Backbone:
């Protein structure tokens, strides 16, 4: 019964301007193998959520170089070096580590 | 991968004169098993 | 290159049973586990449960008494059954491929999502 | 089958006899995944009473 909450509800950013989404957990997301697990998803308006970043900072092949991230225990962040119109949508901070998995509410990245 | 062929009429145990027909499964069969040993022969020595 | 086709009951009356099915077109059920995720934006994405080939399951404890999962391997079908549906169950139900924890601990190959409404 | 204990064993009947089988028991194990990736249907034909 671990609660995951995202800090922003939304984040208007102009094109070419950097943005970030912090989030965190009521419990450290550390597994029995000692690793920290969380994942980041993004959903577009007519699409299912899809994976961008796995574990804490690992890039999926095909991810734009614009995306990166870090964090530990209970405090994590997704970063976009420059936000493009194509990066618009709902970002979700997903618990990762324990079975009754939850995720944050979805952060809407908007163009300002 | 090992490419595999499928066969339905089986001459089980070489009992020539009899054979078994295996009726088909409903569909989409997948299985897995453990390889625990091998039956091998050595080429016999040649007249070298 | 895993594909999913899904269908099911998109409209229920309160207290009825929800039945959603996803067809898997490339693999068996112990290559990855399948899970059900429900979108309901105030809560983001809520996990319902996951099921493997062997019928092994992990359910969200809050739904333990309401939810049943099964796998029909011959039809390549993942099936979710949720009893006593209520207004809170309205949302989008996705079938998701769950990779191993040590590999990625991540959710991919999401189906498009079944749209399920509970109403009078 | 059962697995070899400790390590692999050969157990041939006679290595100098060319006409013999060598039965090898392996250590640990190897997993093999077999598929017939086709979606069939069934018919039932009444051929004789
Ligand atoms: C028995 O063993 C064989 C051999 O491994 C298995 O066959 C493999 O199945 C996998 C899964 O579908 C295949 O892996 C995929 O390959 C894709 C590459 O093809 C595309 O891209 C190339 C260019 O690079 C084009 O030429 C081609 O036309 C295609 O457009 C990858 O793109 C796939 O990965 C994608 O999705 C993942 C999902 O998380 C992302 O992480 C990736 O970054 C990417 O977006 C994927 O890697 C593999 O190619 C098949 N091999 C062969 C030889 O055919 C059998 O399935 C297996 N059978 C059983 C029963 O186990
Ligand atoms: C020994 O080597 C064989 C290959 O030679 C391996 O391959 C097969 O392995 C399976 C699994 O162990 C054998 O059993 C079959 O499992 C299917 C899936 O079961 C699910 O549902 C049950 C519900 O009780 C769960 O307990 C289980 O975990 C799964 O979630 C069943 O569907 C099969 O059912 C049979 O009866 C029904 C009757 O309605 C028929 O419709 C089916 O077609 C089928 O006949 C079955 O129980 C399978 O038998 C093995 N194949 C062969 C040829 O024997 C073994 O895994 C390997 N074993 C070991 C220990 O190494
Ligand atoms: C192997 O054979 C199986 C049958 O023996 C196959 O299972 C069948 O799959 C079809 C899939 O269409 C089910 O038929 C109907 O599907 C519609 C859904 O389609 C419509 O709506 C969706 C959106 O949800 C849309 O995308 C489509 O384009 C359509 O507009 C349902 O509404 C119907 O109620 C019904 O389910 C069959 O019912 C199902 N058969 C069984 C016995 O369940 C299997 O897919 C085949 N291939 C495999 C496993 O690879
Ligand atoms: C293949 O070998 C494995 C490993 O030996 C078998 O699976 C486990 O075996 C151990 C004993 O060594 C048991 O304590 C576990 O409970 C078994 N787990 C499971 C899921 O069965 C496995 O059954 C063998 N056969 C196949 C087809 O995988």
Residues:
């Amino acid at each position: 019964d671990i609660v995951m909450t995202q800090t922003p509800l939304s984040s208007p950013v102009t094109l070419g301007q950097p943005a970030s989404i912090s989030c965190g957990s009521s419990q450290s997301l550390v597994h029995s193998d000692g690793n920290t697990y969380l994942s980041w998803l993004q959903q577009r308006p007519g699409q299912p959520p899809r994976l961008l970043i796995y574990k804490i900072s690992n890039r999926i092949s095909g991810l734009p170089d614009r995306f990166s991230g870090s964090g530990a225990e209970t405090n994590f962040t997704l970063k976009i070096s420059r936000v493009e119109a194509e990066d618009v949508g709902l970002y979700y901070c997903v618990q990762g580590t324990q079975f009754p998995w939850t995720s944050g509410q979805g952060t809407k990245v908007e163009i300002k | 991968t090992l490419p595999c062929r499928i066969k339905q009429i089986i001459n089980m145990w070489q009992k020539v004169g009899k054979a078994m027909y295996a009726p088909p499964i409903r569909g989409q069969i997948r299985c897995s098993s453990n390889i625990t040993g091998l039956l091998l022969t050595r080429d016999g020595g040649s007249n070298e | 290159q895993v594909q999913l086709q899904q269908w099911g009951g998109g409209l229920l009356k309160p207290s009825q049973t929800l039945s959603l099915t996803c067809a898997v077109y490339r693999w068996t059920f112990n290559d990855h586990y399948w899970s059900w995720v429900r979108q309901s934006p105030g809560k983001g994405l809520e996990w319902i449960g996951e099921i493997s080939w062997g019928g092994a399951t992990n359910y969200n404890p809050s739904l333990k008494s309401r939810v049943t999962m099964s796998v029909d391997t011959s039809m390549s079908h993942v099936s979710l059954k949720m009893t006593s549906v209520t207004a809170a169950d309205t949302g989008v139900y996705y079938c998701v491929r769950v990779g191993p924890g040590p590999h990625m601990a991540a959710l991919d190959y999401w189906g498009h999502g079944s749209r399920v409404l509970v109403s009078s | 089958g059962s697995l070899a204990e400790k390590e692999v064993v050969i157990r041939s009947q006679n290595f100098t006899n060319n006409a013999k089988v060598i039965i090898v028991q392996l250590n640990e194990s190897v997993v093999i995944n077999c598929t017939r990736p086709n979606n069939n249907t069934r018919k039932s034909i009444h051929i004789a009473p």
